[PDB]
Amino acid sequence: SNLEERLRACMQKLACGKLTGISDPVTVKTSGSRFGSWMTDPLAPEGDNRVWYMDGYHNNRFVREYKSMVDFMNTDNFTSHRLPHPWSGTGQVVYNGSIYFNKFQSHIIIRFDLKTETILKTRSLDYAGYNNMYHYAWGGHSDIDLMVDENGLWAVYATNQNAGNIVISKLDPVSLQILQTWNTSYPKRSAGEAFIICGTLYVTNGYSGGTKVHYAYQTNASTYEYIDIPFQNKYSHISMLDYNPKDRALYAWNNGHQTLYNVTLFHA
Amino acid sequence: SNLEERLRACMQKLACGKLTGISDPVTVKTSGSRFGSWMTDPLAPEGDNRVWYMDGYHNNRFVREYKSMVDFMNTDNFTSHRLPHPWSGTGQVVYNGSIYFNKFQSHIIIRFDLKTETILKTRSLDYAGYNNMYHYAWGGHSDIDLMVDENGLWAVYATNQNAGNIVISKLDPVSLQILQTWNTSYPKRSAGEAFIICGTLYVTNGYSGGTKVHYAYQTNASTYEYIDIPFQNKYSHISMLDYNPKDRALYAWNNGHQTLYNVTLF
Ligand SMILES: *[C@@H]1O[C@H](CO)[C@@H](O)[C@H](O)[C@H]1NC(C)=O
Ligand SMILES: *[C@@H]1O[C@H](CO)[C@@H](O)[C@H](O)[C@H]1NC(C)=O
Ligand SMILES: *[C@@H]1O[C@H](CO)[C@@H](O)[C@H](O)[C@H]1NC(C)=O
Ligand SMILES: *[C@@H]1O[C@H](CO)[C@@H](O)[C@H](O)[C@H]1NC(C)=O
Ligand SMILES: *[C@@H]1O[C@H](CO)[C@@H](O)[C@H](O)[C@H]1NC(C)=O
Ligand SMILES: *[C@@H]1O[C@H](CO)[C@@H](O)[C@H](O)[C@H]1NC(C)=O
Ligand SMILES: *[C@@H]1O[C@H](CO)[C@@H](O)[C@H](O)[C@H]1NC(C)=O
Ligand SMILES: *[C@@H]1O[C@H](CO)[C@@H](O)[C@H](O)[C@H]1NC(C)=O
Ligand SMILES: C[As](C)(=O)[O-]
Ligand SMILES: [Ca+2]
Ligand SMILES: [Ca+2]
Ligand code: NA
Ligand code: NA
């Protein structure tokens, strides 16, 4: 049981490569307000296709849980979980059964276990801005963006000591301690969103109109480059874009729609 | 236990990289004739540190088994296994309990199970040269060279349809079928020795003198480049150079000496 998860994690790392393409988005659902996030747990056991869904970016503490991806498309059946604190932004992630989010109007990260419904850890992000200071271009208190890739848990934010440029920190999923930190050269307020695939942070140019990935920072070498990978902004406003390594897709909240993007990675 | 093997094979592939260096050799044993091969199974279970030893490039069918590396260094304590046919060259490999070798005066490959002492599979290598035809630069009927890396079992040889240039084939360890073939443009006669690391074939400039790895063929892209990775030829003649994925080292038969090189990957 434990060796299977160790093996699948190794297989994912072996199939890693540079982002070369983003296919056309599929519309999974039309629901919610203009802003929000949705996601699945890439470390979910066999079965367990539960979709987690958080509407809005402010003073909403209710998380919806859908049974599966198909029940998320066609039905409105769900159970609601009340978080002890409201989240800020749409930067939450669900990882190995716990939801990680930014506490409302703070730089505090909270790990909340979804089965027993209890706070497991609370830790402030050192020098991270908050309260619409280093938001993504679309605003909405998106100062801190937590995400998961083939390597584990990550925090994307910005600090005053870095002139408001994006900072990447690898997090420990249990202690929430910063294991390593990279200073990028990209202003977080000028990015429309960001996502990490295989240790590489990809940053988009904006949130409306003709969007593209145009900056990549490689953490394995602390190098960066400007690129041009366009993707279709089907409903013209994107407020959430995150990669899921289990199904190699970007999850997006797009102007009151929930959409999915297949990605292409380089494989010799 | 099967997933432990499956997880370890994944971990090895994930730790792969480009060859960047070869350390100074260490002389493990002084024995044997001018030509031969020695190796360990990269897929031996824990507790199996057996060293396998084959003296000569012809007229010998007796494989020696030593208990461990330390018994190989300091003792002459070994068991003899008599193969059903003599081997050709020094390009044998031991892999997951079987020995793979080229049968004397033929291009046939034989998989021989060591514990049951049984031939498990026989198959002619397709279009491969034999009998001192497309040998390495040192000769010794080394027409066909079987090797193992992180990805499994390989066969390096030359064909006439490839104008005498090195051909690489990935083999199935059970059926001995050719899964995929790559045509290089490196003339096998000019190759001193060759070995595969992480799907890349490395070819040395000679079996003698100031030896150097100077050619790398990347099978993941069918491209090649010229490199410069010098290593010391302690005893002036090398009849065997094999990579072992488990210990990240090169095993060599250096003119009656058995030596080991550590490799550095990127
Ligand atoms: C919602 O759930 C109820 C009870 O669990 C079930 O009877 C009903 O069919 C479900 N509706 C949909 C649309 O899935
Ligand atoms: C996921 O959680 C289980 C127990 O709930 C733990 O044993 C396991 O190590 C965790 N996996 C990771 C990758 O942290
Ligand atoms: C990032 O920048 C801050 C302040 O500019 C500095 O204290 C820290 O050492 C930097 N870290 C790296 C990895 O460059
Ligand atoms: C991604 O590709 C898979 C298989 O090619 C397909 O089943 C799935 O529908 C695709 N999803 C998107 C959003 O393109
Ligand atoms: C071989 O092993 C025996 C005992 O098993 C020992 O007495 C003998 O000395 C060993 N051979 C050598 C060359 O040391
Ligand atoms: C090694 O041999 C065993 C037979 O005992 C087999 O089950 C296993 O799959 C083999 N391993 C490889 C990598 O071929
Ligand atoms: C290699 O060359 C032979 C003949 O020269 C040809 O039949 C074969 O298809 C070639 N293989 C590849 C992979 O190019
Ligand atoms: C190779 O490296 C290992 C560990 O660094 C060491 O124990 C061994 O002696 C080295 N062997 C050679 C031949 O340098
Ligand atoms: C999308 As806004 C101006 O409420 O941060
Ligand atoms: Ca994101
Ligand atoms: Ca060799
Ligand atoms: Na996120
Ligand atoms: Na060999």
Author numbering:
A (entry chain A): 212 to 479
B (entry chain B): 212 to 477
Q: What does the paper behind this entry write?
A:
Olfactomedin-1 (Olfm1; also known as Noelin or Pancortin) is a highly-expressed secreted brain and retina protein and its four isoforms have different roles in nervous system development and function. Structural studies showed that the long Olfm1 isoform BMZ forms a disulfide-linked tetramer with a V-shaped architecture. The tips of the Olfm1 “V” each consist of two C-terminal β-propeller domains that enclose a calcium binding site. The highly conserved monomeric Olf domain has a five-bladed β-propeller fold with a central metal ion binding site.
A dimeric variant containing part of the coiled coil and Olf domain, corresponding to our previously crystallised proteolysis fragment, was designed with domain boundaries 212–478 (UNIPROT numbering). This includes Cys221 that forms an inter-chain disulfide and covalently locks this construct in a dimeric form. We crystallised the dimeric form of Olfm1coil-Olf, after deglycosylation with Endo-H, with calcium chloride present in the buffer. The Olfm1coil-Olf structure reported previously was not deglycosylated indicating that the glycans did not contribute substantially to the crystal packing. The β-propellers in the Z isoforms are covalently dimerised by an inter-chain disulfide bond (formed by Cys221-Cys221) at the C-terminus of the preceding coiled-coil domain. Only about a third of this recombinant Olfm1coil-Olf sample formed disulfide-linked dimers as in the crystal structure, yet the monomeric and dimeric fractions could be separated from each other by two rounds of SEC (see Materials and methods section for details). The switch loop forms part of this top face in the calcium-bound state and alters the properties of this surface. In the calcium-bound state the top face still consists of conserved residues and is devoid of glycans. Another putative region of interaction is the crevice between the two Olf domains, flanked by β-propeller blades 4 and 5.
